[PDB]
Amino acid sequence: DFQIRVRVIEGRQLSGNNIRPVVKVHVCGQTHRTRIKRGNNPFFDELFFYNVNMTPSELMDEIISIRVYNSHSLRADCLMGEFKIDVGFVYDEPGHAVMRKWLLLNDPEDTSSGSKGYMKVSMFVLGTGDEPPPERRDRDNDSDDVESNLLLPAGIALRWVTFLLKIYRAEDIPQMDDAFSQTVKEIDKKNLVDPFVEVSFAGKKVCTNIIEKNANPEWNQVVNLQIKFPSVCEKIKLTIYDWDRLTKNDVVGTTYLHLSKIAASVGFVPTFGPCYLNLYGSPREYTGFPDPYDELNTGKGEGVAYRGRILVELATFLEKTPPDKKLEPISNDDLLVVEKYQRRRKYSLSAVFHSATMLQDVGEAIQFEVSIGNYGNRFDTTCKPLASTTQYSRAVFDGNYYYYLPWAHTKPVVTLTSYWEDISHRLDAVNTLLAMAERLQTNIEALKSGIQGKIPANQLAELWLKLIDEVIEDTRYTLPLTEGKANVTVLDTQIRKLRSRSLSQIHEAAVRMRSEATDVKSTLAEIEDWLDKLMQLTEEPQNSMPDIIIWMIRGEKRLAYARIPAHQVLYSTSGENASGKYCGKTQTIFLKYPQEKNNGPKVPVELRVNIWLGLSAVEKKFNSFAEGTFTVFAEMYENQALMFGKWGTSGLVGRHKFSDVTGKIKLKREFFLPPKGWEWEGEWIVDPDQEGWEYASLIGWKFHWKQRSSDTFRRRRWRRKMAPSETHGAAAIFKLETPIVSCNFDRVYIYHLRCYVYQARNLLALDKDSFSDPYAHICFLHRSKTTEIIHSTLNPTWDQTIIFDEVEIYGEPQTVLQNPPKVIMELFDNDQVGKDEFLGRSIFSPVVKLNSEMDITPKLLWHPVMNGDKACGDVLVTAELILRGKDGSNLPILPPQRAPNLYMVPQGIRPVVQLTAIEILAWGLRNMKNFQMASITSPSLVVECGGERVESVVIKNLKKTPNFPSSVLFMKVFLPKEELYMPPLVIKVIDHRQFGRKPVVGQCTIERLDRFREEIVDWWSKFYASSGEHEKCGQYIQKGYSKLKIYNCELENVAEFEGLTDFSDTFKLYRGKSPSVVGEFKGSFRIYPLPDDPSVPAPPRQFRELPDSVPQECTVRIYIVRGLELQPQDNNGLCDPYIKITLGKKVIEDRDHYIPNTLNPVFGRMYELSCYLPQEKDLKISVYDYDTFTRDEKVGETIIDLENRFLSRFGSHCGIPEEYCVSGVNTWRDQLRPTQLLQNVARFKGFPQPILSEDGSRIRYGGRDYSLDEFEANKILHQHLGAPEERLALHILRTQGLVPEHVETRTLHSTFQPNISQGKLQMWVDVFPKSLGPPGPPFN
Ligand SMILES: [Ca+2]
Ligand SMILES: [Ca+2]
Ligand SMILES: [Ca+2]
Ligand SMILES: [Ca+2]
Ligand SMILES: [Ca+2]
Ligand SMILES: [Ca+2]
């Protein structure tokens, strides 16, 4: 057996606009398909498996078709085409795998003009039982470096285009040298780097000229690339290196030149610029030891510090094909036209720090630093040093687990002045369509909560009208006037034309949606990719504003970072929507460690900041955004010394009488005066010994509160406030060009928060017993609490409300209503020995309720619990964050207490549970796989549903008796009525192996728990009589014989007998961690409501008629009638078919009764076997092909599971006749008489026993009375008829649904086509247990 593995990963630049791509995968005739995605660039990560049993000389002949289609709402999928490749190519590859290779899409004739898309494809062909070399991860480093399958027939792309990438200059490049060559002259440190740009695209690398010792270089060069005009590679890797002779060239930073943000399928050649592109990487401070964060320099990771920026412009000639003229200087007219794109404007930044919580370290002082680009870097040397950093703060303990900062009403303020290009003509568009995208996403989630919650139809209709009218209103946003702005690029005009086209298209289709349709459920498919169209309109290659990187410094060591993209904080005069989302508004920001892509086990700090950025020509209107009152304190001091036992101001050598805090620099009260926009407030007062004297042991040393024995020097304090005087206002803090500025809040607001932590699911097992002991640290700003520990559970139910009182948060309540701070839950595994282990983190926002009219009861939601990178479980939590009014009167009623100071989740927020009886018919396990290459001998079954546990009796010998002695199990579980909150059912299988081990050899998951609430009078004559094929009314039919029924499909496909699976519903098991087939457990579940009183015992069982559950030896008799339309297997164009049967240890090969040269073989043959049931349940019937000289080919095969035939409630073990007869061809072969079968089916159906009459003429059964004269009226009777009671009871058995005699017609399947009809044939099978005695006479 050979195996084909196919994986689809990604699609990029698929042709056509407004497309909904989907991929159909076909391997060797077996065809499936993927899901439907949105947009131009879908991501799939779908995997499919296939198996064929071809010869090794025939395996390479088949092809792999990965054909792609364009899905439509009202039409069928339209073919796009694909480059199919044979199996010989992937088998010819080293390792037998073309692995993560790209693939082309093609029109079969129009592929010469360009490809129709690209699809990332993984191939592997290997034998069965083998394993692959490992594959994982998502990355974009390998693209278009001949990874795409080249030389497809007549479909090579246009490799004639030349990328005219002009590079102009660069600025602010950080120091990448040790500066030893310059500091020996004792002097210039900011300009020592040797930048060159390694351009890289599709595996082609050209290096530009070197400029030595210039952090503001001027290249003015043209670099030429020769690529295909359709190219899968999305971005050019612009990576500035530092050139060095004695060592490998270090990496300054990496930015990317994205093309498909401009492209339309209407479209043009790739263009860009002239626009600056910002680099990011390691912190700018050079170290003599090699840099630990050098991985972030090469683009791996998002970068933690700004590393300069570079002005480039991309043009494209469809000509010039340059082999050797790869580097030419820029002509001078492009040099004076590029000065219009370098025009600087002054910018102003202010950051008010609101909170900095969830700290774990308490040792040594903390601070923060706000820097944009190079401005604000506290380690860079510059004249007039900026107030770019907050003051030092010492964290205090919140009482329970974490630490917070004592900032309280006095918030730190960081103010700095920068110089950037006025690219606000672009970022106005970026911010406005991002506001469109966020409004559309919020309204989409409103529609999603409407359709999931089943709101009334008028509410859903007015919500959808609000959606459509929102797009109607603000899609009329005119793009900014790109004339008179000197920095407008050619890409700006092309992108503006494309955006106007797309915006007018979605606008007119929004009028169409408003005027043609009312179907709110069909139109959301087009809204959901209108949202993706807005995503494709927002994002930019030309963002030259560097990110506001806001750091955390522990002493002098940089510890944690974040970066805000500066477009959502930039202010502009064009409008509020054209301004940023977080412009002048608070935001919750989780800082990360530098090497961490996302925060892992420990968040360093939950920093909350309010950053405003904008042009300094329009910084006058800070006063609309401003909150509180900005305040600066002027400083001077006075030193005294204890000489001759008395304090005095004289004798201060090295200091002054009036001076600064260290005493070294002389100061006076009027040395610093309030500048323009400022006036003095109040008067110089002592700010505290109650006199204010602070004493130290040495001169200019650390002062403290009171004079000890060793203190011989002292000082004291005076401060004077300065406040904004005129209507210059709070904007005057930019005019302080530095004294420490802080924002004073004159009003405090009280907040009361309740977190409803009900339950979790799918938590990791960090203990040795494959469970955990979870608990949660619920932290919110300057408070935290700890929940209870639920021991030995991976699906815990804490059922606990965590309550915080007196959480003081400043600012207006509308500020916290628009931007609530995050409630963070840190789940841990409680270990009684050692430190607890990190389980995960859930971040969600509380529903802020400022007053009584916002009293929405908060629904619990399954917020993800991220650990590392991936989600590792969910928690069902919510929160509410309320204005605490006067005396807490508007606060809700407290939740009840099951324990002292330990609250429960209250009645309206908890999942509404009702008590159910989950009854499990745990019967048997079939088709086991070896655990660690060792057979299974002693399995047992454990049923779990939301933490409730029941166990079954362990099987002593699986090979001998694979059936549980405990057939019926009970669980009494409070299950939620809502489908969302209701937990999945998990089954465990435990094998009694050596060493007293408890291993899991199989696990099962179930989610659809809503389900379980004259002639010779032979058989050829009777077959023709029932079929009506021959004579159709004749004298044989006029003898009144029993008539069978011919079914053209399977009995399993007959919905009348429920597929013969009702008593034995089959399920699917798994093993290990990412998997494949290990086993199958079957047995019917019955999940029905228990009575509402928990003390009341069980209701009567739904499983009350357990049969003989031990295995029984059974005699089988297989009848084969005729095959139809078989596939030829010979050189003569026909087939010579025969029968091959295997029942476990017994094999029958029906060789010498073959039928020559037919495709319709009338077999008419009788095969008798006897085998152990239900162990050998797999009855395999196959048709093979006679050849007198060659190997027998396989025509087809079908699998019949006889235990489902024997154990069915419909009794398909023996096909009953129409009327009861004792001799001839109609002889009763069943070992149980019709009346005993009637009482048996009364037992299995739960029906009462049949009340026979005194002569058998009347039988009462199943709530209905039956009579013999109803069937015997105008019915011909003949001499084989037996007793009248059995005769009548047989007609009851025929009218009640017990299976009569049939000739079924099964489907053949080959190994090449396991689901396609490889012919047809007719069978009917008889099963008789030997426990009920010997069966009747066999039939010919
Ligand atoms: Ca270097
Ligand atoms: Ca260098
Ligand atoms: Ca543990
Ligand atoms: Ca533990
Ligand atoms: Ca043959
Ligand atoms: Ca043959």
Q: How far is the CA of 175 from the centre of ligand 1 (A)?
A: 8
795 phi, psi to nearest 5 deg: -125, 75
Q: How far is the CA of 1064 from the centre of ligand 6 (A)?
A: 40
Q: How far is the CA of 201 from the centre of ligand 1 (A)?
A: 25
CATH number at residue 393: 2.60.40
Q: How far is the CA of 1310 from the centre of ligand 6 (A)?
A: 16
What one-character DSSP code corresponds to residue 332?
Answer: H
Ligand index nearest the alpha carbon of residue 773? 4
Report resolution in angstroms.
Answer: 3.2
Q: Do the Cβ atoms of 301 and 251 come closer than 8 Å?
A: no
Same domain, 763 and 822: yes
The closest alpha carbon to 929, from 991, 1017, 860, 864, belongs to 991
Q: How far is the CA of 275 from the centre of ligand 2 (A)?
A: 26
Q: Which of 322, 342, 362 is at the close of a domain?
A: 342
DSSP 1265-1288: EEEHHHHHTT----TTB--HHHHH
242 assigned ligand-binding residue: yes
Alpha-carbon torsion 562, 567, 573, 576, what sign?
negative
428 assigned ligand-binding residue: no
Q: Do the Cβ atoms of 105 and 80 come closer than 8 Å?
A: yes
3-state SS class at 446: helix
Task: Flag whether 743 is in a domain.
Answer: no
Q: Do the Cβ atoms of 161 and 230 come closer than 8 Å?
A: no
Which residues, listed in sequence order, are joined to residue 1329 by a DSSP beta bridge?
Answer: 1114
Neighbouring CB atoms inside 10 A of 704's CB total 12
Same domain, 718 and 592: no
DSSP 674-700: --TTEEEEEEEE----TT--EEESSTT
Name the pairing type of β-strands 897-899 and 902-903.
Answer: antiparallel
Residue span of the structural domain in which 686 resides = 629-724
Name the pairing type of β-strands 837-844 and 823-829.
Answer: antiparallel
3-state SS class at 624: helix
471 phi, psi to nearest 5 deg: -65, -35
Ligand index nearest the alpha carbon of residue 178? 1
Q: How far is the CA of 829 from the centre of ligand 3 (A)?
A: 6
Same domain, 929 and 1077: yes
Task: Flag whether 470 is in a domain.
Answer: yes
Q: Round to whole Å and give the CA distance between 1080 and 939.
A: 13
1268: tokens are 């013999």
Q: Round to whole Å and give the CA distance between 1071 and 1068.
A: 11
Q: Do the Cβ atoms of 824 and 780 come closer than 8 Å?
A: yes
874 assigned ligand-binding residue: no
- Residue 10 zone, left/alpha/beta (φ > 0; ψ -120 to 50; rest): beta
| Amino acid identity at 617 | A
* Cα angle for residues 189, 191, 192 (degrees, 5° grid): 80
As for the chain, the residues directly before each break of C–N over 2.5 Å are 187, 265, 688, 737, 1013, 1074
* Distance, C-alpha 985 to centroid of its chain: 22
The closest alpha carbon to 1298, from 1228, 1234, 1229, belongs to 1234
Element (H, E) at 492: helix 490-516
Q: Round to whole Å and give the CA distance between 1011 and 1224.
A: 47
Which residues, listed in sequence order, are joined to residue 313 by a DSSP beta bridge?
Answer: 166
Same domain, 945 and 898: no
585: tokens are 């508004």
CATH number at residue 1146: 2.60.40.150
The 3-state secondary structure of 1100-1125 reads CCCCCCCCCCCCEEEEEEEEEEEEEC
110 assigned ligand-binding residue: no
Same domain, 759 and 895: yes
Q: Which residues surround ligand 3, an ion (CB under 5 A)?
A: 766-767, 829, 831, 837
The 3-state secondary structure of 1134-1188 reads CCCEEEEEEECCEEEEECCCCCCCCCCCCCCEEEEEEEEECCCCEEEEEEEECCC
382 phi, psi to nearest 5 deg: -155, 155
Task: Flag whether 138 is in a domain.
Answer: no
1093 assigned ligand-binding residue: no
- Please state at what angle helix 424-453 crosses helix 524-538, rounded to 10 degrees: 160
Count Cβ neighbours within 10 Å for each residue of 725-751 and write b for 16 or more, e otherwise: eeebbbbbbbebeeeebbbebeeebeb
Q: How far is the CA of 401 from the centre of ligand 3 (A)?
A: 20
Q: How far is the CA of 1188 from the centre of ligand 5 (A)?
A: 9
| Amino acid identity at 397 | F
Counting other chains too, the contacts that 669-672 makes at CB distance below 8 Å and 24 or more residues apart are 669/634, 669/636, 669/718, 669/720, 671/636, 672/634, 672/739
Which residues, listed in sequence order, are joined to residue 242 by a DSSP beta bridge?
Answer: 195, 250
1130 assigned ligand-binding residue: yes
615: tokens are 């042009």
Q: Which of 1191, 1209, 1227 is at the close of a domain?
A: 1209
Q: How far is the CA of 1133 from the centre of ligand 6 (A)?
A: 9
Same domain, 18 and 94: yes
Q: How far is the CA of 832 from the centre of ligand 4 (A)?
A: 7
Element (H, E) at 469: helix 457-474
Q: Round to whole Å and give the CA distance between 1177 and 799.
A: 48
Q: Round to whole Å and give the CA distance between 119 and 1216.
A: 58
3-state SS class at 549: strand
- Please state at what angle helix 457-474 crosses helix 490-516, rounded to 10 degrees: 150
Q: Which residues surround ligand 1, an ion (CB under 5 A)?
A: 176-177, 242, 244, 250
* Cis-peptide, bond into residue 1174, ω within 30° of zero: yes
What one-character DSSP code corresponds to residue 451?
Answer: H
- Residue 161 zone, left/alpha/beta (φ > 0; ψ -120 to 50; rest): beta
Task: Flag whether 1318 is in a domain.
Answer: no
767 assigned ligand-binding residue: yes
602: tokens are 């420990």
738: tokens are 């530095």
- Residue 1209 zone, left/alpha/beta (φ > 0; ψ -120 to 50; rest): alpha
Same domain, 660 and 518: no
CA atoms within 13 A on the CB side of 1026: 19
3-state SS class at 887: helix
Element (H, E) at 435: helix 424-453
Q: How far is the CA of 180 from the centre of ligand 2 (A)?
A: 11
CA-CA distances (angstroms) from residue 312 to 275, 544, 607, 1011?
6, 11, 35, 63
Outline where 127-219 has alpha helix (H).
180-183
452: tokens are 């999931």
Q: Round to whole Å and give the CA distance between 1094 and 1091.
A: 7
Q: How far is the CA of 380 from the centre of ligand 1 (A)?
A: 18
Q: Which of 127, 146, 179 is at the close of a domain?
A: 127
**Where does 390-492 show beta strands of DSSP type E?**
396-397, 403-404, 410-421
Q: How far is the CA of 756 from the centre of ligand 4 (A)?
A: 23
Q: How far is the CA of 222 from the centre of ligand 6 (A)?
A: 73
The 3-state secondary structure of 498-546 reads HHHHHHHHHHHHHHHHHHHCCCCCCCHHHHHHHHHHHHHHHCCCCCCCC
497: tokens are 């034309």
754: tokens are 């309740």
Task: Flag whether 1308 is in a domain.
Answer: no
194 assigned ligand-binding residue: yes
Residue with tokens 């909560």: 449
Q: How far is the CA of 379 from the centre of ligand 1 (A)?
A: 19
Q: Round to whole Å and give the CA distance between 204 and 143.
A: 11
Q: How far is the CA of 830 from the centre of ligand 4 (A)?
A: 4
How many Å is the Cα radius of gyration of the chain? 41
Task: Flag whether 1096 is in a domain.
Answer: no
Sheet holding 1258-1261, edge to edge: 1251-1252, 1258-1261, 1264-1267
Ligand index nearest the alpha carbon of residue 286? 1
3-state SS class at 478: coil
* Cα angle for residues 812, 814, 819 (degrees, 5° grid): 105
Task: Flag whether 151 is in a domain.
Answer: no
Q: Round to whole Å and give the CA distance between 1323 and 1160.
A: 14
Ligand index nearest the alpha carbon of residue 210? 2
Residue with tokens 């389980």: 839
Q: How far is the CA of 824 from the centre of ligand 3 (A)?
A: 22
Q: How far is the CA of 791 from the centre of ligand 3 (A)?
A: 11
Q: Round to whole Å and give the CA distance between 221 and 327.
A: 7
CB-based contacts of 881, cutoff 8 Å, min separation 6: 751, 752, 753, 816, 820, 846, 847, 848, 849
Q: Round to whole Å and give the CA distance between 571 and 581.
A: 10
CB-based contacts of 159, cutoff 8 Å, min separation 6: 226, 227, 228, 229
DSSP 1062-1109: GGG-B---B-S-------EEE--EEEEEPPS-SSS-PPPPS-------
422 assigned ligand-binding residue: no
Same domain, 180 and 281: yes
Q: Round to whole Å and give the CA distance between 443 and 447.
A: 6
Same domain, 417 and 443: no
Longest distance between any two alpha carbons in the chain, whole Å: 148
Q: How far is the CA of 766 from the centre of ligand 4 (A)?
A: 6
Same domain, 323 and 179: yes
Q: Do the Cβ atoms of 1233 and 1221 come closer than 8 Å?
A: no
Q: How far is the CA of 1137 from the centre of ligand 6 (A)?
A: 6
In the chain, how many domains are there? 9
Q: Round to whole Å and give the CA distance between 289 and 810.
A: 45
User: How many residues in total does the chain contain?
Assistant: 1340
Ligand index nearest the alpha carbon of residue 191? 2
CB-based contacts of 496, cutoff 8 Å, min separation 6: 429, 479, 482
* Distance, C-alpha 759 to centroid of its chain: 21
3-state SS class at 226: strand
Ligand index nearest the alpha carbon of residue 792? 4
Sheet holding 948-951, edge to edge: 948-951, 939-945, 985-991, 1000-1006
The closest alpha carbon to 555, from 369, 370, 304, belongs to 369
CB-based contacts of 180, cutoff 8 Å, min separation 6: none
| Amino acid identity at 10 | E
Which residues, listed in sequence order, are joined to residue 876 by a DSSP beta bridge?
Answer: 759, 862
Q: Round to whole Å and give the CA distance between 501 and 490.
A: 17
Q: Round to whole Å and give the CA distance between 1113 and 1128.
A: 38
Q: Round to whole Å and give the CA distance between 1266 and 1261.
A: 8
Q: How far is the CA of 351 from the centre of ligand 3 (A)?
A: 42
Q: How far is the CA of 1073 from the centre of ligand 3 (A)?
A: 19
Same domain, 1275 and 1297: yes
Ligand index nearest the alpha carbon of residue 1129? 5
Q: Round to whole Å and give the CA distance between 915 and 1089.
A: 6
Ligand index nearest the alpha carbon of residue 244? 2
The closest alpha carbon to 837, from 848, 846, 828, belongs to 828
What one-character DSSP code corresponds to residue 76?
Answer: P
Neighbouring CB atoms inside 10 A of 497's CB total 12
Q: Round to whole Å and give the CA distance between 584 and 431.
A: 14
747: tokens are 């009003």
* Cis-peptide, bond into residue 1217, ω within 30° of zero: no
Which residues, listed in sequence order, are joined to residue 309 by a DSSP beta bridge?
Answer: 171, 278
Q: How far is the CA of 501 from the centre of ligand 5 (A)?
A: 65
What one-character DSSP code corresponds to residue 1209?
Answer: T
The closest alpha carbon to 419, from 560, 591, 216, 585, belongs to 216
Same domain, 106 and 177: no
Q: What torsion do the CA atoms of 122, 127, 133, 136 make, to the nearest 10 degrees?
A: 40
Task: Flag whether 764 is in a domain.
Answer: yes
